[PDB]
């Protein structure tokens, strides 16, 4: 009889009627169907055949019925047991008078990919969808740090007191980019774009890409994302893109880990009654940003939750638990469009839980949904994760890495002090300055009139002005 | 033997070493010197005489210590107790890292002042200063609702839907009237000004009093406090004013219970062992502001907590406690000008929560001492009251009064629409409109050019610039 098991080897079930049995049985499956091919010499040609495949996949899971195998799960039983307990007793934190409101979370082993335990949904007896692996949604603004700002410093063309513009501007379509009410500001810096979760330099980050042709397709197809059009410019706020929350918990990994990316798995091995080792999981770790980059975005994405501009959750959780609340978390929340999807993804140095809530047929939240009830209900959740397993998140902290170049720039540029063509007239760009990480070998530049990320010529008269009236 | 006991008849003590004992004793020691002093025939006049008093002062002390009184507080065992184990147990939550932070807190039943329990401080055996009872700090921005904006209110000077001017302007000894380093913006309306707490509006609705000779401190000494000199423009951010912590609960009280003041008391009755009473609280309520007054504000202090602006408060007790959390809390924090003391002033219809935090000698705390850790002190304060107590807070909602005026006013003016002389030329004046809730009996005036609480010409020539783009 063939077995499932946890982490330690105890037994989930022999091959019932939860997410746990029924993911890693699929995940199962299959790795049995790669095994069956190549053992019965199927070329991956003779694969595309639908019938021969059809019949590797039946043959697949009676392997697995009727064999003896073992399938060691990377799921440890204390820790998702805690995170079944958090979501049939929190769980209706989430309804926010939209109607019932479903949820899917994702809890990832930082150095290994290991998903340690995981939630599928509200209860499994009422509805089956599994909201972790199998739906997949936009992941709206928890993009951004993965796909325009951790790639922009990454090559050199930001740091992190760089300036961006938040004037307001139009899509290509002529539409104007929205952040709910507002059409946009004025000039700002990066952490403030982040905290705030502006749409207009997120835009203008990704711009800045396409134009100078960098191979953002290269960065996210090392995490494992698949995107279809890179050329969309409201990629950064999540369209264009949909991603299972297992999958993004993923790139939120890579940037928490260091850069490091390691594959997510919930299978580490399956083997034959005998001991055969039919397969086994091979970590392939790929540096996907430098150290410099990710320790950067580390520090940025630590205000993200510190500002609680975007999400309640330090405030839920240094309540609930105000020592774990002390461990060093940084996040990113998400909004989707009309408030059809909200995330929040969490990371300590050890772990990093991801976060989704929204409606199966796509219907609106709340406004307030992934601000607060998302917050509450994840801070609960992080809470009863510690309560099963005491150390799990650590007390380690991030730090910058040291190969990051701190550079001595203006505040009101976030560039180096500098003569600057204003108006056919040099002028002496003087005043007070901070400390701006970066991830290239020089740092910042010196100061240019176009000192920001994005801007029209009529923004830069207005910025400019402003600076000017300083002196 | 002379006892102190709680509400219900409990002793306390035979007449050890806490707060509740001295604080009580102190309280009934005062009570029985009126007692012997009106027993013995000895005029006001003749107690005006140092000796006399001081003879007296201890002749009442002695009389409780040999006597065989019984003093019945209003202190129920159940909830002071509980808050005494809150403090020892989560005290250490308000260590800002400024040194160790001190504390006090009042409980109060809005229907008769009684005063439930209280917090002195972290503990008595290192510290003995009362901060509930004695010690006096200001009140800083708690004092807004009652002095400025209550009293514009209640005057019919003010709706709910006001606009007021946030333009910079100076104190009449030349100094920018400051929010941290903001110099201030432009208009705003009445609940953007309380809930971000600005202090510009608040200079210009006290200003506004005192042009119009309102008698401020027959609302003030209505409730119980004393101020020494009320032209100090600053009065509604707490200059000039200094209170315990037990006499600003009562000013709350006096908003929570519909604008009706009850004394504030911890002594319900003293007796003889005969039986004799020989004082009884006698309760002589006030309306010190309208029905309609009252509950116009309490609508005003429920969106300055729930829009988390200067308190985290509702985010910390939604996790701690989501089904108290979901009671109608609304209530008013306070910061002094170095953060040298930090007020959260909280409310349902049955309760008011009085707090402070600060350090006894003045010191500074940290920027985000009031804003983020007293919130967490109190949510897990209010919990164990709760906790102990399970419908002490209530379930009940405030609601406006039926004598609370409605009028339909532009959301740009807050008064109603109608045709002003803007710059030589008569303007129709049009556009999307919100009700506003007033106190007196006409409601809202028609729209004039100075529709603002506040503002210089140049104020209101930026302002009209951009209400007329809007038309
Ligand atoms: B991102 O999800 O923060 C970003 C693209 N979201 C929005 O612009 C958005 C969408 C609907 C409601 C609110 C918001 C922002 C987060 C205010
Ligand atoms: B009131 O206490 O909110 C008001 C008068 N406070 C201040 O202006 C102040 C003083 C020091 C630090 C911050 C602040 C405000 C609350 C930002
Ligand atoms: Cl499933
Ligand atoms: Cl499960
Ligand atoms: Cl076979
Ligand atoms: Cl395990
Ligand atoms: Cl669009
Ligand atoms: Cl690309
Ligand atoms: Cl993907
Ligand atoms: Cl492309
Ligand atoms: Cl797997
Ligand atoms: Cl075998
Ligand atoms: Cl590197
Ligand atoms: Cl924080
Ligand atoms: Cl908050
Ligand atoms: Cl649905
Ligand atoms: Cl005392
Ligand atoms: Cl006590
Ligand atoms: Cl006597
Ligand atoms: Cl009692
Ligand atoms: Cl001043
Ligand atoms: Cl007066
Ligand atoms: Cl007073
Ligand atoms: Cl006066
Ligand atoms: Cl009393
Ligand atoms: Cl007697
Ligand atoms: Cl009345
Ligand atoms: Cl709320
Ligand atoms: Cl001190
Ligand atoms: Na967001
Ligand atoms: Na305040």
């Not at 990066?190 to 191979?215: C, F, H, K, Q």
């Amino acid at each position: 009889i063939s077995e499932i098991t946890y982490s330690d080897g105890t037994v989930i079930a022999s091959i019932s009627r939860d997410y746990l049995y029924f993911t890693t049985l699929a995940e199962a499956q299959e790795r049995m169907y790669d095994y069956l091919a190549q053992r019965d010499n199927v070329s991956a040609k003779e694969l595309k055949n639908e019938a021969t495949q059809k019949f590797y996949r039946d043959l697949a899971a009676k392997e697995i019925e009727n064999g003896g195998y073992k399938i060691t799960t990377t799921i440890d039983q204390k820790i998702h047991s805690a995170m079944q307990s958090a979501v049939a007793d929190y769980g209706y934190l989430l309804d926010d008078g939209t109607g019932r409101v479903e949820v899917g979370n994702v809890l990832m082993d930082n150095q290994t990919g290991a998903i340690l335990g995981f939630v599928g949904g509200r209860n499994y007896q009422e509805n089956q969808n599994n909201h972790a692996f199998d739906t997949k949604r936009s992941p709206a603004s928890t993009t951004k740090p993965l796909l325009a700002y951790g790639i922009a410093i990454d090559q050199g063309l930001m740091g992190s007191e760089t300036i961006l513009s938040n004037y307001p501007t139009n899509f290509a379509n002529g539409n104007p980019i929205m952040y709910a009410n507002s059409k946009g500001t004025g000039m700002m810096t990066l952490g403030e774009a982040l905290n705030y979760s502006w749409n207009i330099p997120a835009y203008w980050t990704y711009r800045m890409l396409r134009e100078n042709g960098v191979d953002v397709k290269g960065y996210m197809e090392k995490m494992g994302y698949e995107i279809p059009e890179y050329g969309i410019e409201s990629l950064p706020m999540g369209g264009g893109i949909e991603v299972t929350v297992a999958q993004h918990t993923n790139g939120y990994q890579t940037l928490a880990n260091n850069g490091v990316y390691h594959q997510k798995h919930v299978i580490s091995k399956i083997e034959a009654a005998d001991g055969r080792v039919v397969y086994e999981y091979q970590d392939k770790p790929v540096q996907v940003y430098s150290k410099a980059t990710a320790t950067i975005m580390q520090g940025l994405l630590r205000e993200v939750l510190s500002s609680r501009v975007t999400t309640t959750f330090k405030s839920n959780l240094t309540s609930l638990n105000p020592t774990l609340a002390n461990a060093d978390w940084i996040g990113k929340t998400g909004t989707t469009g009309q408030d059809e999807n909200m995330w929040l993804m969490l990371s300590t140095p050890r772990l990093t839980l991801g976060g989704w809530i929204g409606h199966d047929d796509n219907h609106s939240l709340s406004q307030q949904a992934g601000y607060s009830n998302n917050s509450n209900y994840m801070a609960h959740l992080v809470n009863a994760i510690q309560q099963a397993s005491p150390s799990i998140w650590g007390n380690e902290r991030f730090a910058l890495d040291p190969s990051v170049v701190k550079s001595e720039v203006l505040k009101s540029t976030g560039q180096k002090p500098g003569k600057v063509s204003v108006e056919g007239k040099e002028v002496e760009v003087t005043g007070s300055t901070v400390t701006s990480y970066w991830a290239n070998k020089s740092g910042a530049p010196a100061t240019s009139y176009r000192f920001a990320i994005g801007g029209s010529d009529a923004d830069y008269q207005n910025a400019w002005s402003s600076i000017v009236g300083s002196l």
